[PDB]
Write a protein that binds this ligand. Structure first.
Ligand SMILES: Nc1nc2c(ncn2[C@@H]2O[C@H](COP(=O)(O)OP(=O)(O)O)[C@@H](O)[C@H]2O)c(=O)[nH]1
Length: 304
């Protein structure tokens, strides 16, 4: 086994967790974290932790990371016992808020302290949200880098091209929750069901690496594997030059038709796009609910 815990920190972070529940992830345990008592109620997670009750009285962090920072420090023990037993902890949050920007780095440090492989999956706010949010988020990012083994950062502006253009600003973060689900699912599924690798290989590629890029490719057809890999390494989601990688993790999820030769033909594509001296590790995830559709996920770490 491997105990995989996903911890949502903040408003958007918890919205992502709900989205993961409704999507039907099962290899993972979900924790909700917020200084907002009301929004925490709306968490579909099995475990909810109110933080900083004596400091904020359950009313939200008012968009100041500093408040979120001590709120988590004040409730360290409750965080500590939630993270308990986890071989690996995902911290997912939106950067630029209060509870998220401030507390998530704390949640990450505690988890990494306890000896869990700690991966952060976060977003940069939209550009239109303003300079304050931007700066607050940049500080939020950097804080996380020092608190996690591996940080995945997804700018919301990079999703703006795949937003409908017929979308209210209320629904504007439904693509962020989606990618956050994919970010977590792509890795977690590799550990649980994946063949061809195992948890110890993932710890090697991911411990103390720093920033990581993620790319996803979906395809079906005669040479579906190659096309799916080709989409993943040319995905919009990353600043494209994965070539800087000193580590690559690959998830090829498919149906029962998915063969080894197909996997390899897709693994070769990714390897040719990265440094020749890259430590590549990849695995096969079987989802029988798929017939011909294949999903390739690459996480490039170790840079730089
Ligand atoms: N994934 C996701 N991100 C969000 C959502 N709402 C807001 N965000 C992003 O997260 C940032 C604010 O985080 P939020 O959770 O709302 O604030 P906090 O609870 O005080 O930490 C904003 O700048 C948004 O870019 C959401 O529902 N889902």
């Amino acid at each position: 086994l491997a105990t995989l815990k996903v911890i949502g920190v903040g408003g958007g972070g918890n919205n992502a967790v709900n989205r993961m529940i409704d999507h039907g992830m099962n290899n993972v345990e979900f924790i909700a974290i917020n200084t907002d008592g009301q929004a925490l109620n709306l968490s579909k997670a099995e475990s909810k932790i109110q933080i900083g009750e004596k400091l904020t009285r359950g009313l939200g962090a008012g968009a100041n990371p500093e408040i979120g920072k001590k709120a988590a420090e004040e409730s360290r023990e409750q965080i500590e016992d939630a993270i308990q037993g986890a071989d690996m902890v995902f911290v997912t949050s939106g950067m630029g808020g209060g509870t998220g920007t401030g507390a998530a780095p704390v949640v990450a440090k505690i988890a990494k302290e306890m000896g869990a492989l700690t991966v952060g999956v976060v977003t940069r706010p939209f550009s239109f949200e303003g300079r304050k949010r931007q700066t607050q988020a940049a500080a939020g990012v950097e804080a996380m880098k020092a608190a996690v083994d591996t940080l995945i950062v997804i700018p919301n502006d990079r999703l703006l091209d795949i937003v409908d253009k017929s979308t209210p600003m209320m629904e504007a973060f439904k693509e962020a929750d989606n990618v956050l689900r994919q970010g977590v699912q792509g890795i977690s599924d590799l550990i649980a069901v994946g063949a061809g690798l195992d948890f110890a290989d993932v710890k090697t590629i991911m411990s103390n690496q720093g920033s990581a890029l993620m790319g996803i490719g979906v395809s079906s057809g005669e040479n579906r594997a190659v096309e799916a890999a080709k989409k993943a390494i040319s995905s919009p989601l990353l600043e494209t030059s994965i070539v800087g990688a000193q580590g690559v993790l690959m998830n090829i999820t498919g149906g029962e038709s998915l063969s080894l030769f197909e996997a390899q033909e897709a693994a070769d594509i990714v390897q040719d796009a990265a440094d020749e001296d890259v430590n590549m590790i990849f695995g096969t995830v079987i989802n029988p609910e798929l017939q011909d559709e294949i999903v390739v996920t690459v996480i490039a770490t170790g840079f730089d």
